[model samples]
Target: QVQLVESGGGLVQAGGSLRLSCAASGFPVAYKTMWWYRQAPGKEREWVAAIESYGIKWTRYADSVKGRFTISRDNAKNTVYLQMNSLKPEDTAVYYCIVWVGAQYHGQGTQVTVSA
Candidate 1:
C-alpha cells in the first residue's frame, strides 16, 4: 500500500505563494509522473502540471499559464514541488500530487485557499 500526504496552509493571501509537500511511503514511486490539480468550490478539475519520478516535466496550460505553473522534484526521496506564479483567489482548491496507472495511483490531496 502507498500513501501520499501533503502539508500546507489553508489560507494564502493574494499575491502570495503557496507551498505544498507530498510525501509517500509504502512503495518506491514508479515511472509515473506527479501531477497538481485544482478543484474550485464547484468547478472542474484543472490539470496544472506533471513531473516524472526522476524529474522530467510537462504542462497542460495555454499561453498565459505556460510560464506561470511549474512542477519539480528531488529524486533522492521521491518528492516533488508545485509552484505557481502570480497567485490569485481563483487558484484556491485542494491540490493533490497525483499519478495513475490507468487511474489507480494518486494522492488523497490537500486544500489550498487564496483570499485577500
Candidate 2:
C-alpha cells in the first residue's frame, strides 16, 4: 500500500535550476529503490535516475542527464529529491517517481516548464 507524491515543481527560466520532491508513505523509504523518469510533450518517457539501497547505497543517472540531474533519498523524511541544473526549454517535461513494492508499484508525476 505504498504511495508516492511529486511536488515542488513550477516554472524555471532557461539556464536556471529546479528541484522537485517525491514523498513516500505507507512504507519505509529504505525498503525500495526509487526511479525517476521524464516525458516531454508528445514524446516517449526517458529514464532519468535512480537511488538504490539493496546491498549498497548509490545513485545512477542516464548518460544524457549525467552531471545535470541528481537524485537523492532522505530516509528520515521518507522523500526522494530530484535536482536538475543548467536546464533548457527541452528539459520541460512531466517527471515521474516510481518505486517497486513486492507485486506492485507506486508512481507520482509532476510537470515542469523551462521558459525564457
Candidate 3:
C-alpha cells in the first residue's frame, strides 16, 4: 500500500508560503500525482490541484491562488511538494495528498489550521 504524508503548518504574517511534502512508497511509476484538497471541518473536499510526476504545474484559481500557489515534485524519491503563499484563515482545512489510478491512494491527511 502506498501512502503520502504531509508535514507543515505556520502563520505567514508577512505572507510567504507553507511548504508541505508528500512522500509515498509502493507506487510503480513516477506518474504518481499528489493532490492537495481542503475540507472545511465538515465541508466537502475541494481539489486544489494535482501535480504530475515532474510534468506541468498545478493550476490555481485566478486573482486569488494563481500567483500564490505552486505544486512540484521530486521523481527520484517519489515525493511531491506544495507551496502556498499569501496565507489566510480561509486556507484552513485537512489537506490530503493522494495518488490514484483504479482506486485513490490517500495519506494520513495533514491539517493546516491557518490563522493569526
Candidate 4:
C-alpha cells in the first residue's frame, strides 16, 4: 500500500525558514507528482505548490506564497520537501503532502507555528 509520512514541525520565529519533509513508501516518488497544502487555524485548506514529473520536472506555486515557498524532491530517497522562507504569523498552519495516482493519498500533516 502506498503511504506518505510527513515530519518537521514546531515553533519558528517570524522571518525564519522552515522545511517540511514527506517520505513516500510502496511507490517511487520520481514517477509521481507531489503537492503541498496548508490549513490555517479555523481556515479552509489551501493549495501551496506542486512538483510534476512528466518526462520533465516542473513546479507550480500559489500566488500567496509565490516567492517564499518552494518544492523539491529526492528520487533516491523517495522523499519530497516543502520549504518556506521569510515566514510570517499567518504562515502558521498544518502542512500536508499529497499525491494522486487515480486515487489521492495524503500525509498525516505537520503543525507549524510561527511566532512573532
Q: Evaluated with TM-score, which candidate comes out highest?
A: 4
lDDT of each: 0.67, 0.86, 0.69, 0.91
lDDT of 2 by residue, 6-93 (tens): 9867898999988889899998877788888888989998989999965688899999889998898888999999989998898899
Q: RMSD of candidate 2 to the true fold?
A: 1.5
> Number of clashes in every candidate structure?
0, 0, 0, 0
| Candidate order by decreasing lDDT | 4, 2, 3, 1
Worst 10 residues of 3 by lDDT: 54-63
TM-scores, one per candidate: 0.79, 0.91, 0.80, 0.95
User: Candidate 4's residue-wise lDDT over 1-116, tens digit each?
Assistant: 99999898789899999889999998889899889998998989999999997578799998988899889998888999988899899889999999987799998899989999
| Cα lDDT tens digits for candidate 1, 38-57 | 67779888777766554444
Worst 10 residues of 2 by lDDT: 100-109
Q: List residue ranges in candidate 4 displaced over 4 A.
A: none
lDDT digits (tens) for residues 12-33 of candidate 3:
5445568877787777436755
RMSD of 4: 1.0
The TM-score that candidate 2 achieves is 0.91
| Best model per lDDT | 4
- Which of candidates 1 and 3 is the stronger one according to TM-score? 3
Better of 3 and 4 by lDDT: 4
